[PDB]
Amino acid sequence: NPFDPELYKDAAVSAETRALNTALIDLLETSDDNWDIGVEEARARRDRGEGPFPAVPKSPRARTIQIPGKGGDIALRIIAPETPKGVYLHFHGGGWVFGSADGQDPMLERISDTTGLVCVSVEYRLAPEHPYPAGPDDCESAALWLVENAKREFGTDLLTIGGESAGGHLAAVTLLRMRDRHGFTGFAGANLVFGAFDLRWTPSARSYGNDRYLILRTLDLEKFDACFLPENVDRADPDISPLMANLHDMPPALFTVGTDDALLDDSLFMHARWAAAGNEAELAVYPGGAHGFVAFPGALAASAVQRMDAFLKRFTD
Numbered sequence: 001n002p003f004d005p006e007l008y009k010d011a012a013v014s015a016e017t018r019a020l021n022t023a024l025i026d027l028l029e030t031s032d033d034n035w036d037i038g039v040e041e042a043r044a045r046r047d048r049g050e051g052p053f054p055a056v057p058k059s060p061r062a063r064t065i066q067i068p069g070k071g072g073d074i075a076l077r078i079i080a081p082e083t084p085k086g087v088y089l090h091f092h093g094g095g096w097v098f099g100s101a102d103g104q105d106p107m108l109e110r111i112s113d114t115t116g117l118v119c120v121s122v123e124y125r126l127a128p129e130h131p132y133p134a135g136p137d138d139c140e141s142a143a144l145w146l147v148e149n150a151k152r153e154f155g156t157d158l159l160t161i162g163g164e165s166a167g168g169h170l171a172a173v174t175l176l177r178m179r180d181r182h183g184f185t186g187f188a189g190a191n192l193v194f195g196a197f198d199l200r201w202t203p204s205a206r207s208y209g210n211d212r213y214l215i216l217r218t219l220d221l222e223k224f225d226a227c228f229l230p231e232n233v234d235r236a237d238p239d240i241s242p243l244m245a246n247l248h249d250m251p252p253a254l255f256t257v258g259t260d261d262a263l264l265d266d267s268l269f270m271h272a273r274w275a276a277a278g279n280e281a282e283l284a285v286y287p288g289g290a291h292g293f294v295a296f297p298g299a300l301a302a303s304a305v306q307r308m309d310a311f312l313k314r315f316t317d
């Protein structure tokens with residue numbers, strides 16, 4: 001199914017999806033570029049709800065747990081059911097530069113209500129103020145804290161992980177760190193939503209181009225790279241590009257991606273290697289889907305959401 005070539009042709013893109021993408025492109029090309037206004041101003045504009053996209057409401061159910069990290073306290077954002085059936089450890093996207101733990105409360109609340117999972121979203125340090133390995137260090141600190149304390153805090157030891165884009169990257173990096181550095185392979189499932197797994201940039205990431213500002217341009221990836229990775233690094237390092245890693249004994253994973261995404265190849269490649277290492281692996285490909293398409297209205301996003309939430313719910317009983 002996800003390798004049906006028809007899935008990748010223009011004909012498979014619904015009228016609704018094409019129209020949404022066209023409007024998003026226009027919206028983004030009309031508004032000031034984030035790289036033109038600079039990082040801090042771009043964050044500040046999103047903060048006061050002034051960005052291309054309308055602000056995202058915060059849940060009154062959200063509460064915060066400060067845990068210790070290498071660079072100080074790390075904020076863990078919590079949305080919990082009355083009786084948690086497990087934990088969803090979540091990492092926001094934003095190219096290791098933008099986004100926040102409190103930037104997607106509606107989604108987290110939806111996940112928690114449907115799955116019965118307590119959602120824990122991590123405020124990991126952001127580049128370029130705090131380049132690699134700061135972000136990954138904080139995500140590892142969170143995962144470690146959960147393994148140690150989830151029973152006490154939430155009355156459960158069932159752990160899942162997930163994230164969008166750079167958050168998907170971080171989810172994979174964190175899984176591999178927990179296995180390699182701490183001998184822990186106890187996560188039950190991984191929700192990897194259009195993540196970046198090869199920071200050398202896969203073919204589709206290099207060739208997507210900038211002529212069409214559909215959420216994510218090749219330019220954006222190049223800028224994220226410059227912020228996140230010091231000159232000192234080797235992008236082939238498995239801690240930097242999880243696609244390069246030995247993937248043995250990883251949890252079941254769902255890879256969710258649209259065909260109109262610069263990072264398409266990242267999900268296709270990571271899926272293939274995930275399966276080839278002997279793990280359970282599902283690839284869900286959505287025709288015409290933009291990068292970040294699951295946040296938008298419309299039937300295509302709704303279908304991806306149903307699939308992802310059902311995937312997470314599976315690991316609870």
Ligand SMILES: [Cl-]
Pocket residue numbers: 009010011012
């Ligand atoms: Cl066609």
